[PDB]
Point group: C6
Chain length 219, copies 6
């Protein structure tokens, strides 16, 4: 499968290049260390993919990893694009969660629960970046505070799923949280597409239910 | 199956957008609440489809659901397009039946009888909307009263199938009812295509048999 | 198999439309009742095909049925096209046999013998219509009386196969009859293609053998 | 397999048409009776193919039969094209052997030995017609007498294989005879392609061996 | 597999035609007898292929045989093209070995060892013809004497493999001989492509090792 | 699989031709002997591939071998292209390791460990040539000394894997070494693509860790 191999490889290279560009752009020591901790596992992906072609477990690990990296760099980029301190530190810790999970993957390529944990975290990151993009496109204060709210939700849920791979019940609660966050961001996108704030209020109801849930999920 | 995944997803998005457009158009609190109760399960479809790609039961549930939604929005739309109070409230309760069944689906993705119940209700809704379109195209009073008649039949049959998923005998009677309704609407379409009222009288005979049946099916 | 589904559906619709056109054209109460008894099972085919897609027994029943209908409408059409009373009543009872068999099918979708009986009757009808078309193209008196003769044979054979699905021996005799009729109509077509009456005399010998056989097949 | 069905059917029709054309052309009562005995089984092929589509044994019988017919009509045609009495009666009895074998096939569609017997006879007929065509193209007296010789061989071998389907030893001897005849006609074609009579003498040696063999094969 | 059948058949015909052309060209009684002994088995290939299509053992025998024939005619052709007596008689006995092996094949179509023996001999013949072509293209005396040398090797190895199909040890020694000959001719072709005699000396070393081996392989 | 066969064959021929060109270009007795020891196994690959087509183990051995050869000739070429004595002797012994492993392969086509050893050595060679190309493109002194460093690493690792095919622990340590070398060369390429020396310092850290590891791997 040299075609898929080279495809994944170029994806990894593109991820790393975009990460390094963003890091140079920000001129921030923290973002710098983050981008380095990211490009490292990107290049390690490339190496592992190379040495042993046509091996399915390894290939599966590699594709999911490079996907996570694309997500995280999108997140870092849009974060600095917004420029708001609160959301900036939020997304920074978010991408940190991403790279920590990916590191746990690179240490263990056949532990199912950590694979699924990275999956969930990738989804949460895509959710947060969708929300931030929507907020930027509308440029609406209430939309912005709601985006901060659900990004808080996303980072807290990802933190919790990162802490313990175990605990069925906590796992299901976190899965439901992620579902609610995705729901909120989708309905926000739709409300933006029609330009109606009433469904934005519906979304506010949805995320209010979500955060009330997450509160008890903390314990 | 990312191709089918994205296809279903865009279908769900298009359904929700058309629903919201119709709701804004009508400016009716009732239709508003209906469209909201609809777009909710549409977006929930999108989320569930996303989180777990390539899982067949979930995919099967999602496609059938978005089909039901397309049907219901067509129904709501053509209903307000006609403007007649009787048929308007009729189609409104019809789409309510649709969304209640779909909700029961979203609560349970592997109960066969409720899957088949939604199937039947979708069919009945397609039947009713076909009848209303035919009536609109001909613009004939007798055609209109017959359309009201078989729409009454459709809503009553759907109500009954919604009430109990069980009871083989009631199930078969309702299935036969739906078959007769489809038969009537097809033969009406044909009579419209040739412009002959004699086969409209044949259709009247058919639906008369159908409603006489449904009467005893009530008990 | 939505492609084959829609194909069969449009075939059924086209059959019904052509039937209704022919019935309007003839202005004959008998042909009218026949066309109605036909369009009914055509539309019932459409309904049954719809409700349960991708179910093989039902699909098999539907395709064979719509084929029978195409055959019968061709037969009714060419019959009134010829205008001769004898052959007209003949073909009328022929299409009646067709629709009676099709009705027996719609009542029972998994009885093999009646499936095969409809098959044979469809074949006989195609044979008769081929013979009538050939006679019309040549416009030859002897050809016309021979066509009447073998159409008599066809209607009698179809009547007998309709009477009893059972009785191996009568079944084989009727099958041989149908084979001989097809043979006669083919060799007549060929003789027409070359314009030689000598092979028409050979065909006369063939059908003479056929009718002598059918005589004892009556008992 | 409607495509292959219609293909075989048109092949049968074309065979019969060419046969009838040739028969009309010759104006010979004998050739007339032959062409009739041929077109009969051609049309019977068409019928049997029709009634029971997608049945492999029947299909296999039909294709082989129509192939035999194409061969025999080619043989009858080229025979009358040459005009020499000896070879004319020879090829006439040849095609008679062909149609007798084909009749035995139409009576029994699953007797292997008669299938193989028709196969061998078809091959022998193709051989004889190849030889006659080659002789016609060269227009050489010695070539013509050699063609008469190996056609005698072919008709005698076909007669013998027609007599008894059994007798392994006689079967193998006849198979070897057919092989030698094919060999002779091929090497004659080649010698014709280069225009060298020396290899014609080699072919004469080959057929001399062949006929010496056939002599003892008679007993 | 009528496509592959006709392909093999035309290949056989082309082989025979080229052989006969070469034989006519040389005007040599010996080459004449050789070409005849060749065209015979070519045409016999065609016959056997014909009578029993889609039979794998026979097909396998036929393709390998026609390949051997193509090789041998190439060899005879290039031999007379060179015009040197020594190599001429050499290649003549070479093609004689080829046709003797092919005859043994036509007598026995399922003896594995003789199949492999023909395989090896075909390879050796391709080797010799490659060497002769290379020598002709360079037109170098030392290249010519080396070509004579390795052609001697090839004919001796082929003679030995023809003598006994058995004897694992002699078989492996002959296989190694053929490998060394192929190696020498390839490295000679390469040296010719770059125009460097140093690798020609390397090739001389290779073939010297080869012939020293073959010496003891004689006993 | 004649297509893949001819593909591999032409690959082998192209490898040998490029090798001989490079050897002629350098005019160095050592490089000359190396290129000869290389072209020998290239041509032996071609022979073995030829004699036994469609045999998977042999085919697998052949493709991997010709890949190794392409790598080694690239290495020899770029080495003489750089012109630095240290790296020149380094790459020379490198390609010597390559050809020794390939020879061990040609002696044994089904020993797994030596297959994997050649695999690793091929990877290391591709790594070294990537590093040398990168250094040439940047033309940076520090880059050049780092390239010399990791090439030392590569040659030492390849030497060790060549020594013993056994010893799981030494095998895993060498595999990790190769991974680190690939990592370093990739991150160097990236740093070159962006023109930033900071990630070059990161690469220096990586290779420093690598060489500290290799030190203890020596014992």
């Amino acid at each position: 499968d040299e075609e898929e191999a080279r495809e994944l490889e170029e994806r990894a290279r593109e991820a790393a290049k975009r990460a390094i560009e963003a890091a140079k752009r920000t001129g921030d020591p923290r973002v710098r260390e983050l981008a380095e901790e990211l490009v490292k596992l990107a290049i390690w992906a490339a190496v592992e993919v190379w040495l042993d072609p046509s091996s399915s477990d390894v290939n599966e690990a590699l594709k999911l990893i490079v996907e996570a990296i694309e997500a995280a760099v999108r997140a870092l980029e849009a974060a600095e694009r917004t420029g708001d301190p609160e959301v900036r530190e939020l997304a920074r810790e978010l991408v940190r969660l991403a790279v920590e999970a990916a590191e746990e993957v690179q240490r263990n390529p056949s532990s199912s629960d950590v694979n699924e944990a990275l999956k969930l975290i990738v989804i949460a990151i895509e959710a947060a970046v969708r929300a931030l993009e929507a907020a930027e496109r509308t440029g609406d204060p209430e939309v912005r505070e709601l985006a901060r709210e659900l990004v808080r939700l996303a980072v807290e849920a990802a933190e919790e799923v990162q802490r313990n791979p175990s605990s069925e019940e906590v796992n299901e609660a976190l899965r439901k949280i992620i579902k609610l966050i995705l729901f909120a961001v989708m309905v926000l996108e739709l409300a933006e597409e029609i330009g109606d704030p009433t469904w934005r209020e519906m979304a506010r109801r949805a995320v209010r239910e979500a955060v009330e849930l997450a509160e008890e999920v903390q314990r």
